[PDB]
Design an enzyme around this catalytic site. Structure first.
Site, mmCIF file in Angstrom:
data_model
loop_
_atom_site.group_PDB
_atom_site.id
_atom_site.type_symbol
_atom_site.label_atom_id
_atom_site.label_comp_id
_atom_site.label_asym_id
_atom_site.label_seq_id
_atom_site.Cartn_x
_atom_site.Cartn_y
_atom_site.Cartn_z
ATOM 1 N N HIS A 196 0.354 -1.858 0.252
ATOM 2 C CA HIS A 196 -0.215 0.455 0.046
ATOM 3 C C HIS A 196 0.825 0.922 0.279
ATOM 4 C CE1 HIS A 196 -3.331 -2.336 0.534
ATOM 5 N NE2 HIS A 196 -3.049 -2.547 1.948
ATOM 6 N N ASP B 208 -2.239 -11.700 -2.289
ATOM 7 C CA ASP B 208 -3.065 -11.272 -1.098
ATOM 8 C C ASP B 208 -4.014 -10.862 -1.612
ATOM 9 O OD1 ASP B 208 -3.831 -8.101 0.929
ATOM 10 O OD2 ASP B 208 -1.666 -8.985 1.597
ATOM 11 N N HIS C 107 -5.426 -8.232 -0.508
ATOM 12 C CA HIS C 107 -6.332 -6.499 -0.629
ATOM 13 C C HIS C 107 -5.875 -6.061 -1.664
ATOM 14 C CE1 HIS C 107 -6.646 -6.931 3.630
ATOM 15 N NE2 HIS C 107 -7.914 -6.510 3.548
ATOM 16 N N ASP D 259 -3.660 -13.627 3.225
ATOM 17 C CA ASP D 259 -4.966 -13.272 3.684
ATOM 18 C C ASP D 259 -6.343 -13.359 3.373
ATOM 19 O OD1 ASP D 259 -4.285 -11.753 1.807
ATOM 20 O OD2 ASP D 259 -4.159 -9.577 4.019
ATOM 21 N N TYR E 146 -3.376 -13.398 8.698
ATOM 22 C CA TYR E 146 -3.800 -12.690 9.894
ATOM 23 C C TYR E 146 -3.750 -13.686 11.065
ATOM 24 C CZ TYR E 146 -2.853 -8.376 7.593
ATOM 25 O OH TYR E 146 -2.866 -7.176 6.879
HETATM 26 O O1 LIG Z 1 -3.579 -6.919 4.868
HETATM 27 C C1 LIG Z 1 -3.112 -5.648 4.484
HETATM 28 C C2 LIG Z 1 -3.812 -4.038 5.015
HETATM 29 C C3 LIG Z 1 -5.233 -4.139 5.759
HETATM 30 C C4 LIG Z 1 -5.911 -2.848 6.640
HETATM 31 C C5 LIG Z 1 -6.610 -2.684 7.045
HETATM 32 C C6 LIG Z 1 -7.255 -1.662 7.598
HETATM 33 C C7 LIG Z 1 -8.958 -1.599 8.395
HETATM 34 N N1 LIG Z 1 -9.046 -2.235 9.283
HETATM 35 C C8 LIG Z 1 -9.343 -3.483 8.748
HETATM 36 O O2 LIG Z 1 -9.811 -4.082 7.896
HETATM 37 C C9 LIG Z 1 -9.843 -4.778 10.248
HETATM 38 C C10 LIG Z 1 -10.767 -5.405 10.219
HETATM 39 N N2 LIG Z 1 -11.108 -6.535 11.221
HETATM 40 C C11 LIG Z 1 -9.916 -6.142 11.706
HETATM 41 N N3 LIG Z 1 -10.690 -6.688 13.647
HETATM 42 C C12 LIG Z 1 -9.683 -6.544 14.732
HETATM 43 C C13 LIG Z 1 -8.424 -8.288 14.907
HETATM 44 C C14 LIG Z 1 -7.926 -8.070 16.066
HETATM 45 C C15 LIG Z 1 -8.134 -7.238 17.603
HETATM 46 C C16 LIG Z 1 -9.728 -6.213 17.038
HETATM 47 C C17 LIG Z 1 -10.143 -6.374 15.681
HETATM 48 C C18 LIG Z 1 -11.702 -8.074 13.476
HETATM 49 C C19 LIG Z 1 -11.665 -9.654 14.006
HETATM 50 C C20 LIG Z 1 -12.824 -10.165 12.957
HETATM 51 C C21 LIG Z 1 -14.505 -9.757 13.434
HETATM 52 C C22 LIG Z 1 -14.606 -8.153 13.087
HETATM 53 C C23 LIG Z 1 -13.592 -7.046 13.086
HETATM 54 N N4 LIG Z 1 -8.899 -5.458 12.278
HETATM 55 C C24 LIG Z 1 -8.921 -4.931 11.424
HETATM 56 N N5 LIG Z 1 -2.839 -4.919 3.056
HETATM 57 O O3 LIG Z 1 -2.818 -6.415 2.370
HETATM 58 K K LIG Z 2 -3.877 -8.172 -4.579
HETATM 59 ZN ZN LIG Z 3 -4.160 -8.000 2.894
#
Ligand SMILES: O=C(CCCCCCNC(=O)c1cnc(N(c2ccccc2)c2ccccc2)nc1)NO
Ligand SMILES: [K+]
Ligand SMILES: [Zn+2]
Ligand SMILES: [K+]
Length: 358
Positions: free
Chosen positions: A134, A172, A174, A265, A305
């Site tokens: 990103h 990936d 995303h 992921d 993750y």
């Molecule tokens: O990989 C990447 C980078 C990607 C960057 C994403 C930024 C926006 N953020 C999320 O997309 C996101 C979605 N989910 C969750 N967790 C969660 C995890 C640990 C602790 C607490 C919560 C979650 C789990 C189960 C059900 C609902 C929520 N955390 C963040 N690029 O390639």
């Molecule tokens: K991709």
């Molecule tokens: Zn990703």
């Protein structure tokens, strides 16, 4: 003489989140993957390649001087100032060790590409963090500081010749917005991404990731987006995409080096992706790409993750590079209807540019 290289260094565990210790991009992501390679007796079959720091001149192959200088200054900030700087980007946390860890991730991948191109090894894997795809020329985004994969392409061209042909495959879950933008007007680097889209509502939330973005200028035809909508996709949809789109375009381009932006992921069990690709599925995708570029392939960790899922999935990819026989998949079953709609939209967009599709 080992035909597969491997790089890992435990110093990259020091980047951490001091306000949220259960944030999903955890230090133990890389140490769990290394431990599984010991349990399966794969590490002793590989040639160990050492980590190093990237230099500031190397970072300028893709990034501005102002962006390099701002991230460098965080090495000596106090806690209140680190929290303020991080909140200026979209989805970023920073500690005093972050700059050094991002330099080690990039230099590890430069040493791996040099070993492949000089014939010391045939192929290789890199177990590295924080991730890269990103990050843009002038900013950080989405857990990423510098664009590791894009930098490795420009490094490889700098030590051989300027027009060396490089393919980047981004599996990936995303979209890699920074990689697309860096190479958008370039015909020497072909970018192909598969990703969850949902009509623009999944991270990173932009219509730049749709199938009708094909490149600019002399780069028209050299950017390929495969977007998924309304469906929990798995092995059947990913095999179909490789057979009808990824492999025909790749063979016509005829690359001299293949880099994989290999997030795990999209795997069964991931808490952010919600998809169902299996360890046997990732083994079949690895074996298909080994037929390109006289075998010159480098696999680079991005996201992913579920700690047990990423450890089993990346270890199966290393087993394929060493030459082991591919395991069998599940029985044949129908594709989901929305996945066939996506594949047909990409074929209509790229048929003017690639004769193997018409
Ligand atoms: O990989 C990447 C980078 C990607 C960057 C994403 C930024 C926006 N953020 C999320 O997309 C996101 C979605 N989910 C969750 N967790 C969660 C995890 C640990 C602790 C607490 C919560 C979650 C789990 C189960 C059900 C609902 C929520 N955390 C963040 N690029 O390639
Ligand atoms: K991709
Ligand atoms: Zn990703
Ligand atoms: K391109």
């Amino acid at each position: 003489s080992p035909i597969t290289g491997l790089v890992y260094d435990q110093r990259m565990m020091l980047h951490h989140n001091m306000w949220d210790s259960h944030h999903p991009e955890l230090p133990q992501r890389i140490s769990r993957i290394f431990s599984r390679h010991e349990e399966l007796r794969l590490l002793s079959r590989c040639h160990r390649i050492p980590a190093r720091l990237a230099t500031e001149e190397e970072l300028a192959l893709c990034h501005s001087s102002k962006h390099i200088s701002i991230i460098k200054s965080s090495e000596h900030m106090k806690p209140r100032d680190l929290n303020r700087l991080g909140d200026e980007y979209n989805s970023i946390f920073i500690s005093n060790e972050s700059y050094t860890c991002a330099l080690l991730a990039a230099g590890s991948c430069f040493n791996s590409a040099q070993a492949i191109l000089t014939g010391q090894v045939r192929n290789a894997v890199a177990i590295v963090r924080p991730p890269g795809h990103h990050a843009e020329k002038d900013t950080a985004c989405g857990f990423c500081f510098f664009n590791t994969a894009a930098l490795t392409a420009r490094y490889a061209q700098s030590i051989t010749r300027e027009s060396l042909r490089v393919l980047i495959v981004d599996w990936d879950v995303h979209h890699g917005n920074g990689t697309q933008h860096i190479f958008e007007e370039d015909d020497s680097v072909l970018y192909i991404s598969l990703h969850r889209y949902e009509d623009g509502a999944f991270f990173p939330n932009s219509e730049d990731a749709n199938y009708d973005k094909v490149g600019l200028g002399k780069g028209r035809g050299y950017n390929v987006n495969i977007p998924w909508n309304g469906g929990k996709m798995g092995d059947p949809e990913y095999m179909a995409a490789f057979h009808h789109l990824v492999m025909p375009i790749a063979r016509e381009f005829a690359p001299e080096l293949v880099l994989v932006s290999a997030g795990f992921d999209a795997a069964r069990g991931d808490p952010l992706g919600g998809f169902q690709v299996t360890p046997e599925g990732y083994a079949h995708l690895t074996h298909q790409l080994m037929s390109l570029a006289a075998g010159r392939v480098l696999i680079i960790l991005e996201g992913g993750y579920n700690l047990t899922s990423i450890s089993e999935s990346m270890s199966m990819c290393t087993s394929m590079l060493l030459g082991d026989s591919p395991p069998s998949l599940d029985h044949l079953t129908p594709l989901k209807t929305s996945a066939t709609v996506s594949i047909n939209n990409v074929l209509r967009a790229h048929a003017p540019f690639w004769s193997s599709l018409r």
